[PDB]
Design a protein around this nucleic acid. Sequence first.
DNA 1: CATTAGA
DNA 2: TCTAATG
Length: 327
Amino acid sequence: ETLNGGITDMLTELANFEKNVSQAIHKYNAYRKAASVIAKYPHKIKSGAEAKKLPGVGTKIAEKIDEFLATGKLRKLEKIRQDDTSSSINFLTRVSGIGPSAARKFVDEGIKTLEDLRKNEDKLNHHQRIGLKYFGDFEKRIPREEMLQMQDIVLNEVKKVDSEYIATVCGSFRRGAESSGDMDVLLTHPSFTSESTKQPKLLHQVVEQLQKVHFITDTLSKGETKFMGVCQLPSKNDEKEYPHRRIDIRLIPKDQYYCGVLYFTGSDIFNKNMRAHALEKGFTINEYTIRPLGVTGVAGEPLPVDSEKDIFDYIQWKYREPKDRSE
DNA sequence: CATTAGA
DNA sequence: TCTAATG
Ligand SMILES: [Mn+2]
Ligand SMILES: [Mn+2]
C-alpha cells in the first residue's frame, strides 16, 4: 500500500505506455499483473531478484526494479516522459471520443494539439467533435450543489411524462460525495422487464422531454436502452452560465433495477465486499440479479427484489445507507 | 462486460 | 462485419 508504492507506480507508468503509445497488450498486460502482486507483497522489496521471486516477475521487470531501486529514476521512464509523440497520444486521448487508436492516427497525420484538432474538425466524428467542443467543461468536476439542481430537473420531467417512471441518480452523488464527474440516471418502468419485449420509446420519450426543455443539449449516442449525452443548467439571470455536463441515462427492465442500482452506487469496494459475502451467505450477486448458490458447485434462479433492502435481507446483511457504501 | 457508432 | 470508445 506504500512499501511498494514507487515500484508499482513505475510499473504502471510503463504498463500504461505499452498499451497506449505502442500496441503492446502483452507487455502491457505484463506490467500490471506485475504491479498487481508486488503491491500485495508484505515487505519492502529490496532488490531485483527479490521481487523476482514473484509470479509475474520476470527478468525484464526485475531489471527495471533494480535501476529504480538503485537510482531514484528509470531511464526508459525518463525517455518517454520527455518524448513528444507519446506525449501527444497521452493528450489527444483526453478528448471525449478519442481513444489511443485514433490518438495514434491523428498523431501520425500531425494532429498533436488542441488547435490542430480544430483546424481539422472535419477529421473527427460527432462524438469527438463534441468532445472537443466541451473539452474544458468535460474536465471540470460537478458540484453536488449543481448535482442537486440537475437531479431536480430530471426527476421532474420524468414524472411529468410518466408517473410510472422510476429514476435514480446513481454513483458518488448517490453516495453523499461532494463532487461528481458526470451524471448517471438509472431508469426503469413497470411495463419493461426481463421478458416484456422492449419499449424503446420508453427511453426515447424522456430523452425528448429533457431536450424539449433544454436540459439535454447534445446527443453523444442514443439507442433503445442507453443514451449518452450532454446537459446544462439554465443559465440564470445572466452573468453566469453553466458548464456542459456529461450525462448518461439507461433503461432497465423493472425486474433488475435494484441489483442494477445497488451495483452502480458501488463503491467498487463495497460491491466486491458485498459481493464476497453473498458467496458465504449462499448466493451470487451481479449487476442484474442474485441467485441462490447450489452445492453442486453452481446454481441459478434469480431471486425477487423490490428494493435494495430485499438484497441485504437475502444475504442477511446490515442495510447500509448509500452514505456508507464507502467500502 | 456491454452497448452504440462507424465505415 | 469488426473495431473502436465510454461507461
Ligand atoms: Mn459518474
Ligand atoms: Mn457515466
